[PDB]
Amino acid sequence: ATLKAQHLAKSYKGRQVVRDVSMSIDSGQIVGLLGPNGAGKTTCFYMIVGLVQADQGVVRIDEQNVTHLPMHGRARAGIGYLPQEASIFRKLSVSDNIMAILETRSDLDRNGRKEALEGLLQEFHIHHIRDNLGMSLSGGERRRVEIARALASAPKFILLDEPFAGVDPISVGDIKQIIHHLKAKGIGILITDHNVRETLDICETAYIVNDGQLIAEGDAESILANDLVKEVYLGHEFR
Amino acid sequence: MATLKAQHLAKSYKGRQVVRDVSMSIDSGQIVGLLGPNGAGKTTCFYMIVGLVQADQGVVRIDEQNVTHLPMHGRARAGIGYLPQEASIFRKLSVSDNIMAILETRSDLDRNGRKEALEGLLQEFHIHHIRDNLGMSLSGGERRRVEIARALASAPKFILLDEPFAGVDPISVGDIKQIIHHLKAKGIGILITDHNVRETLDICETAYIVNDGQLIAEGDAESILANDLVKEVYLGHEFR
Amino acid sequence: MVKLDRYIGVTVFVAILAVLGVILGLALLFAFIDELNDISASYGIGDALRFIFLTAPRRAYDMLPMAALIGCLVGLGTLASNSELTIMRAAGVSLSRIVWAVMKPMLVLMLAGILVGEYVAPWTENIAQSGRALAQGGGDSQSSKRGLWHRQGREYIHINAVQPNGVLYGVTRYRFDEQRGLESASFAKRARFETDHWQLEEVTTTLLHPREKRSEVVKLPTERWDAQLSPQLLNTVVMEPEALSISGLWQYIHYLADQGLNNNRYWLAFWTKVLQPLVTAALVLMAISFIFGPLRSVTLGQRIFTGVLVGFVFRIAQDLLGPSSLVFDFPPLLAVVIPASICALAGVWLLRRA
Amino acid sequence: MIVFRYLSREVLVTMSAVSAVLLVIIMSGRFIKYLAQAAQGLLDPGSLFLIMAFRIPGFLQLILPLGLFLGILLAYGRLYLESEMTVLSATGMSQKRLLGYTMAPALLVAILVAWLSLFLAPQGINQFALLLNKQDTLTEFDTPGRFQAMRDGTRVTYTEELSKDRGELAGIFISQKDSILVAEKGTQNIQADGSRYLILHNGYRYDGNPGQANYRAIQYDTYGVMLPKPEASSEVSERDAVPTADLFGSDNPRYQAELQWRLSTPLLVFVVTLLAVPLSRVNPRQGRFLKLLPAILLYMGYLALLIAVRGQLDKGKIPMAIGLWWVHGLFLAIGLLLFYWEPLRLKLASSRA
């Protein structure tokens, strides 16, 4: 499977913030989306997710163009989304956060949903916290429960939003473990973040976007050794 | 050569002891960083030093002057500035007016003195060319320079920055560092709390790590990066 | 989708119930303050409390369309500001399913509203406005303001109070011909309906010869005034048209149609009590539209304030458009149809832009 | 002095907007009330604009203090949420100096209302009433006669056949009982400027009334109709149009209490600021808007507690001297307590140490 966003473009009130952005995400490939805050980076990320309607360009999940479908159809073709803020169901148990989404899936019967719930509880080591309200969870376990909930919908690409924002330097070693686990299943994780050091570490291909245009692309070495990025985004003294 | 002497601080929220017996000290011309895990008492200690949270025990003492029970305008009249994390510029006022609205509160200056101080602050931070632009039409970089010039217009002895390296590009921190170095050169002591450990540990000179209320380590960057307890509870085993 | 429906449903239902509790609560208080003006003599602060309280079921039925609006706003914003709706949308759940999930408890809510406004509100309102009518005004011939006046060319009549079982009280009548000899006058006491004719008791009909003679009062405990107005009609005429049940409004509308009198004021109340579920549905559709749009990220205070402001404009509109159907000749159905339709169209448009 | 004309500008603009919205809402409500009586035919559908134009001063004077209250709340909450006041406090600006900055527009809003209450509302209430006497169905509305009885009930308003001519009706029922005009028939000799009074070729003017079980004998009368004017009775007593000067030295209790009610709104503007500078403060979570509604209920309680005491002062119950003055006191104290709560708490802390 491949998520090709082609020739994206979007004009805000008066000015145009995105101009001819073309990304390509494959399955089992971590891709990072980076750039200066003022430029159009979160705009491209949201236009891929579906919250912002583009003006040009197409979004295709393996010859399944969804450029006009809302977030409903984008998620039904298979696209995850994990908000930066806490999105746990506060008054629902942990064993019910996953099940309220497993009940949405149609291909699963009564036994299949129970088996999937058991597998998802065992995979992410939240089996002993299966009877705690969402508001009773700490920051460390909340993210694991949210990731399990996201996988309960059986997506193909999960589009994380700000995973390394405001976390301790010791919890990034666990977030990266979860991301590696997600990649090991055949998912097309897409990370956008303001934290360059860890995003360029975990990711395999980064799309630096400035002034609503791609100025660079490639692995970490081909990004940290470029010249436009060193001039505008990273600065000449960045490591 | 003044000093800030927050000592034996303590505070409790709803029974639990958030902060318990933390002691800090800042001097004039010194940059001190306050770091720690998010759930620890780092933010609470910073706020009780600033004055936004009332402590239950301990005394804050600037140069033998108990400012513990003062509101956050007798703390700031003794020489303790403050700079909130978010944008705190006067949106519908010019830059010259942003500085002069604070210069006019000074009782140590006259009209000529205020005008010369305004010119000095306007030329020192290289914002003389944007002296007529409204505060709502300033970029992310010039906004911080205007805010820091405005804060200096009150002539403090200590500026307590809050999250300076917050959502800024790697090229932007190279300028915030120059501004902090200028503040240190002038004589102001700076206290910095931030979630970005690398940059703060680089800029500061003596960092206090707060975990579970109490202090767990203190000293410069080298003695903090090589301590077993902070590498077990805060920085992990792979930091640098 | 069972677990999600119960979570969206319990949340909006507890909130609508809490908002109706505060609104019925403030409104009963503003009403007591007003009643206190007239507590004097016959009416006592304790008695006023029975009227403010037994008129509660009606006050609630009226506020259900506003309580539903504000409760839906609050109970769906408490899920939208916690980012628990973007998760539902990104899991494959459409907006139509969320709207249906919110509507399912509200369909039960409007059923309960219909049942109360048809079977409980008329009874409690009638008891309250009969007790207060008896208390404030049993004693004197023209003193009471809850009294009923009827018209004949020859005579004009006032009855102080009426009771549902049959007992009647306080009647004063003046009968004038073009000639109008002041032979008799009317002031009266209790009038239990006595067969065909109300029996005016202890009448002080003032008897005089106009040109040159004295006036004397004769009281008869069996004196009878025959019924131009029968007892049931007497129950309906005194009651406010909004307080009548639908099955009573239909009968009274058709009765007035038979006699040729104008019943256009009684059509508006019928339509209001019948089309109320559709108005509630339109209001909650507009509220759901607001949550998905402008008020997705605002705080609780802004949502409550927005709700009140829109709600007020609605009520005032329904009060401009209501009695204007009689001043300007257009059907009274539009008076209730137009504002709900406008709210529904605005909600549909704002949902379409998304 | 630059912060002075920042906080005295945003507050004024927000007050203007809020006052406009409140005026629109109150005008609409009074319009719904008056429209219905017109559907019954008791008022002129065509004269519903002059009354709303003449009643503007009263609504405006009762709204402007609320406009200032909500304007201060919204403007200072906006400044608090954008950190524009955290840096003002962190530079030396007191909380007794914010009040001094805020009582500059509160002095202009308290001159506007002190003028609307003393020199403009009486004239508007006076002309509005005059027009009711100039008109008030002066011609042709007597009621196809539909039975009509006045709210006062002294005077019953009726004609034999909703005669627009209203002349020589077999039964003219304008009958006013305390001594009641009784009209055998009423020729329409009317349209006097003071009120419509119609000659009865024969008007009994039979003063005795069956209500007291008494008959008193009187014969023919002319110019009979009195002023059965409902709307003026509904909202205007001469006290609401009497000039202020006349109110000054009078011994009628009503005239003495009205001076106190009239000069009780300039003072409301000031008490309201003391209650809005302290409560304006907001966390980013609570928002500018959470407290705007609880405030409206407190303002309404202020207006109603005072109204109730005015009545007690003219009924002889409360000595004039004490007056409405106590009510302002309870609000000034609730206001002082909100203001000095924080310093007090901290000072208590100093002692416990």
Ligand SMILES: CCCCCCCCCCCCCCCCCC(=O)OC[C@H](COP(=O)(O)OCCN)OC(=O)CCCCCCCCCCCCCCCCC
């Ligand atoms: C003759 C009859 C006269 C009746 C007069 C009644 C007058 C009542 C006036 C005072 C009402 C105060 C209500 C205060 C509500 C706001 C306070 C609040 O925060 O409520 C939250 C509460 C939360 O609900 P909770 O208990 O947690 O339930 C969760 C279950 N999983 O939410 C709640 O559950 C508590 C609030 C319940 C509100 C109940 C009142 C509104 C609904 C009934 C309206 C009246 C109906 C009248 C007709 C009755 C006919 C039989």
